[PDB]
Amino acid sequence: LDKKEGEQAKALFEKVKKFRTHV
Amino acid sequence: PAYRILKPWWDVFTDYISIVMLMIAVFGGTLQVTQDKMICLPCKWVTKDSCNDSPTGIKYDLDRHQYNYVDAVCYENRLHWFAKYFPYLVLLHTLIFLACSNFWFKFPRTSSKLEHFVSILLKCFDSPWTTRALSERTKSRIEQGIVDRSETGVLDKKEGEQAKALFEKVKKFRTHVEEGDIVYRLYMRQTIIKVIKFILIICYTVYYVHNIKFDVDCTVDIESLTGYRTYRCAHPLATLFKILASFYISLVIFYGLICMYTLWWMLRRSLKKYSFESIREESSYSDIPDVKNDFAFMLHLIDQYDPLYSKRFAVFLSEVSENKLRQLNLNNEWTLDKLRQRLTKNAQDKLELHLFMLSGIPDTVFDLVELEVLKLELIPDVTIPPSIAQLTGLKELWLYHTAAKIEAPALAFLRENLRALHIKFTDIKEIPLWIYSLKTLEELHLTGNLSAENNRYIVIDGLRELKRLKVLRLKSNLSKLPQVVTDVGVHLQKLSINNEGTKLIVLNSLKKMANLTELELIRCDLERIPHSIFSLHNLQEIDLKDNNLKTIEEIISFQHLHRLTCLKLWYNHIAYIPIQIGNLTNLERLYLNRNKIEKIPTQLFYCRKLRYLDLSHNNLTFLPADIGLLQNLQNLAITANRIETLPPELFQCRKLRALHLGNNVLQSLPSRVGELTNLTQIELRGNRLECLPVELGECPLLKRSGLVVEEDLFNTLPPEVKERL
Amino acid sequence: PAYRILKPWWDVFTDYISIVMLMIAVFGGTLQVTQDKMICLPCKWVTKDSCNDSPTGIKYDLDRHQYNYVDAVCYENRLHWFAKYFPYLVLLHTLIFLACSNFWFKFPRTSSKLEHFVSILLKCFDSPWTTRALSLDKKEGEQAKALFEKVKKFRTHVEEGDIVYRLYMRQTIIKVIKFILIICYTVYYVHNIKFDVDCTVDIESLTGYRTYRCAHPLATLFKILASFYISLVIFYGLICMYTLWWMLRRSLKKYSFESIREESSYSDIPDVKNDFAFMLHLIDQYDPLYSKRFAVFLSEVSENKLRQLNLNNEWTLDKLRQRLTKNAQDKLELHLFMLSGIPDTVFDLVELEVLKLELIPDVTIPPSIAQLTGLKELWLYHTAAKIEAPALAFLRENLRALHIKFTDIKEIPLWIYSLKTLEELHLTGNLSAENNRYIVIDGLRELKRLKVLRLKSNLSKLPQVVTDVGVHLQKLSINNEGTKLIVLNSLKKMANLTELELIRCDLERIPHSIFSLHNLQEIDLKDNNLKTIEEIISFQHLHRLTCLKLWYNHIAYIPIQIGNLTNLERLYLNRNKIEKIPTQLFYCRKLRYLDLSHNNLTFLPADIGLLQNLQNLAITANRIETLPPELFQCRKLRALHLGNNVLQSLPSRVGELTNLTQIELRGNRLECLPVELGECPLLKRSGLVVEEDLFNTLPPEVKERL
């Protein structure tokens, strides 16, 4: 992950969960 | 930027309606200019009017040219003016609706506030801090929720700085926008004028439809020029213009209905008042502001564009969010390199660190595994995050008027540590009910003023279970000491009361404890020494100072005790020493300072193991030859007493390491004291010595550190003491 | 961009009106080209009253083609002059008004001022420095500084301009002129727009009829367009007149920041009187916020703070402490050698008794000295002297010594007489007779308290301010140039003089006004042109001389009057090429320190053995043969410095003293060295400079033992 894909994927996961919850 | 502030029933429909209205104006206009012919023709059967009341043809016998003239006259001098200028009318109305809907747009007095607002709008769905913020018996002792929710993550000085800048900007931009209501006023004015023009347009245009006709009876006065008086005349475009007028009227009605909705909306609910109530209802953040002006109004307008905006903005504009941000920013800067700047030590060192200027508790401080002492001064919201587990030792913690909110789940750590705890307090209840939960606390310092009632409640519930309490210091008025003190008192080794408001009987405490291996009464308003103090068989130390104590006559029964070893009597009014003190020989310390002592009988010499004596600021003017017997004397002050030149017995001793002479009469120090060789310091001040002895060369420890002199000449020794230095 | 310099009640309206006016020209133009027909037709009635009134048809036997001719003629040389060219009158004036509006843009000598003006305002507006200035990470300093330099150069350039202001006025004026004229013409010529007109052109020879009646088909549209046009123009004119009102009832050639200055952190703003002021008013009209951000940015007070912050962010307390050293009379010596100013962090060093400043411009030392406790000594050298801090009491409680160095005359401040607690002063500098007299009066005349005074200068003559102040003088020193040895009335006035030093001064002979100074107790005469010691005979009759240094001179001869002295604790006979020493030095048995070096002695007398208290003895570079046994007939001889002499070996007996702390043996050509020397407890490689081990027994033993 080169210690950055973790952050990137995690941010996307949080956004997806909030988006999904809203939709 | 209009797109992000696009209004559902204000901009959306209006723009498409306006486009259609313009299109119909253009279509009609083009036709009106070139397709309008108005074909007229004369008629013969004229009775009253209309040329009626009647195959080869007629043969009117008129010139093709003159017919065009007739057409022009009938067109100009007849009715249906509405039809003649219908597309111009439409164009005007269309332009009015278009223009009135866009005054604010591109107009500096309004666009300025919109630009500030929009700048914020474009940051709420950006600056990742926002999305981090959006991620969300008891007895005030439980906070593991916040411990795990923060995930101990960082902002890496990026989200930190971005969010900080946005906090400065949201506060400033709001302060600017919040000053008035121009944006609000314009939208209300615009909404109302749209409705006004709508009503007028419909009334005007539905009435003048009776003007659009298949034909007209043309009765213009031109027969003297063209022969016929009455003409019948056709207007082909009239069919189409009835249709166009109808379509335009319907279009305006649609516009009107929507405009009524928007006017309806702006009146049914207050728009300036606006707060994120829905956020505190759903979210963990109850910290919701409410202002009534253009800022709130503009937020309210976009609330109906997307609720997501409101969620982002609301969590950002919060002091909860800012406080979390600040703690994270603290960690970003206040790292090990900064902590090291303050890693000092004073005495019984234990590697201290005191955090005074911080607005909260850093987490980085618990990376200082090497420290044993942490001092917190005036820091709010102290939870002590449960990441103290990486520390090994923690021998002392100072809660120096900080916060009672210690609720982190790390009592197990603290219960294996904290031999000492210091609590400074100005209030009554900022002292947490945390202390008794610690079991390994041996030493407790309580400083601040509590009433007898407060002493009883705070001590009974906050402290009573400290079975290992050995040292207790109470800097409080203590008009009564709660029974907790006497109960811990039977295991308690040291009890110290140090306050000006102390006025009480402590005899019961002294009797119950019967131990108190160290006893202190400092600034207590005492004149009388409680007689039960002599039941403390293991007293081993007693400090009676800054009292109204004016007598030592009472210390008669000290021999009831064993191993006293120390008696401090400084800053009192004991102006006289009796002959009871000579029966106290099991003493290794005696201090008589500023007590205005006029005389001391030769009694001190009996305590041949005294070794340390302070005789100062007394109107004594005398040194007995006790000094010639106490040959283990290492430290003695003879100052501020106007003693004459020191008697030779001064040097008939062995060490007298600290020779403090001053504010007396001494033309010359007996030179023979220099042969003790154990002098480490000589103070010769305010005594008017003429010269200094030249026999001090015998003592190797009078290098130029211990030579506290006024002259520093009349000698040959200066280079020796300088080289030794 | 241009938007932010557009005028709120001027330009948006001008553009919208210009657009609509052009629309009218376009509509009317097209209309005029294809719809104007002038249907005219003859009449048979009384032509004296234009065919008045005093069913089949009239017939009028004319051909259709012939009628086109009639219409054309009636159109060409009859009525409707205004209507015929109405859309062109509209187009022409509309274009003029529009061109006038945009005249100041894209103009040869306005664009450059405007472009720089806008760029600067935007940079000031969005600069974090402006925000901080409202009350740097080492980069905002550079950014703000660059903007400040650009602003100063921009302002200087614009300062000489009067173009933007004047062109705008000319433009406003011409719009008003054209406005008045267009109304006069457009409003007046409307009586020519008629539907029905009378055509009486003389074409009878071609048509038979002379009088024709005629219908202008667009009379109504031109009346409508003209009325709508006039109203557009009047509105336009209201703004044009407003502009002159605004431009004439407000100076606008000048701009003040008073309404901002009393709200913000700055006070140092000049009254702008040029095109910059005019441009400032225009942005003030758009949005005052830009006037404020600019004003906050442009401030000398702000520049001072910016620079001060740069110093504070570099010269932090750790940076200062790390570089804080001590060399002699320690007192925490902190040196700041290349700073652009003085950081505030230096005043949090409460314990910093010594501060040394050099090469620092504009030093002012803001009064935050109260934060400090000890400031016992201050060195101000080759810096600046603008310290006017209203805090003499703090300074007086401290600054026992001041060391101040100068390169010119006027650089010297007068903070000396104001500190009457001063004990010690050191002055170096460029002097002259009058320049020194004037400054020394102003500087030292009131310091009765002064005890120590040293001057490094080309003085050439001793001032009497010093001799008068000197009545309380403990220590006096002067060097690097000869002065008239004014001793006859100087030493007598000073009279205490317990330490005198004369270095590199043109002294060939010793003055004799020092001979009666029994309280001298210390005297150092070195690097002088003095080549003798003949004067020192009765000089030594004074008790307690305790020190006589005659080194670095040309005194190759020592007399035996030297035996007159019994009280001496230091004697230096260094680099004088002396060829002999008499046994007359021992008389001072308290001597303890004797320097015999760089002479041409070649031998030593039996004087050493008479000084049992000789502790420090230097015998170097004198070509002295094997040292006489008196060398070790003493009790201390802590320092035995031998070198550049001739010694085959040390006598073993000197090593039996055991009080030797160091023996220097360099350049003496020793063949060997005895073992007794290694027995001495303090010669264990303690400074024992030797060329070789010299066949000794315990050199590795003493090396390990140390």
Residue numbers in the entry:
A (entry chain E): 232 to 254
B (entry chain F): 15 to 68, 94 to 175, 214 to 802
C (entry chain A): 15 to 68, 94 to 174, 232 to 802
Give sentences from the paper.
VRAC is a ubiquitously expressed mammalian anion channel implicated in diverse physiological processes including volume regulation, cell proliferation, release of excitatory amino acids, and apoptosis. Previous studies have shown that SWELL1 is required for VRAC activity, and that the presence of other LRRC8 subunits dictates functional characteristics of VRAC, including pore properties. SWELL1 is organized as a hexameric trimer of dimers with a four-layer domain architecture and an overall jellyfish-like shape. The transmembrane (TM) and extracellular domains (ECDs) surround the central pore axis, and share a previously unappreciated structural homology with the connexin and innexin gap junction channels.
To produce homomeric SWELL1, human SWELL1-FLAG was recombinantly expressed in LRRC8(B,C,D,E)-/- HEK293-F suspension cells, then solubilized in 1% decyl maltose neopentyl glycol (DMNG) detergent, followed by purification and exchange into 0.05% digitonin for structure determination by cryo-EM. Image analysis and reconstruction yielded a ~4 Å resolution map that was used to build a molecular model of SWELL1. The ECDs, TMs, and ILDs all share the same 6-fold symmetric arrangement; however, in the cytosol, LRR domains dimerize in a parallel fashion with each LRR at either a 10 or −20° offset relative to the rest of its protomer, producing a 3-fold symmetric trimer of dimers. The nonequivalence between identical subunits arises from a hinge around the conserved residue L402 in a helix of the TM4-LRR linker. In the extracellular domain, 25 Å above the membrane, a ring of arginines (R103) at the N-terminal tip of the extracellular helix forms the narrowest constriction in the channel structure. Therefore, R103 is a critical residue within SWELL1 that impacts ion selectivity as well as pore block of heteromeric VRAC channels. Within the pore, constrictions are observed at pore-facing residues T44 and T48. Near the bottom of the pore cavity, a constriction at the intracellular face of the membrane corresponds to a short N-terminal coil (NTC) sitting parallel to the inner leaflet of the membrane. The first 14 residues of the N-terminus of the channel are not resolved in the cryo-EM density, presumably due to flexibility.
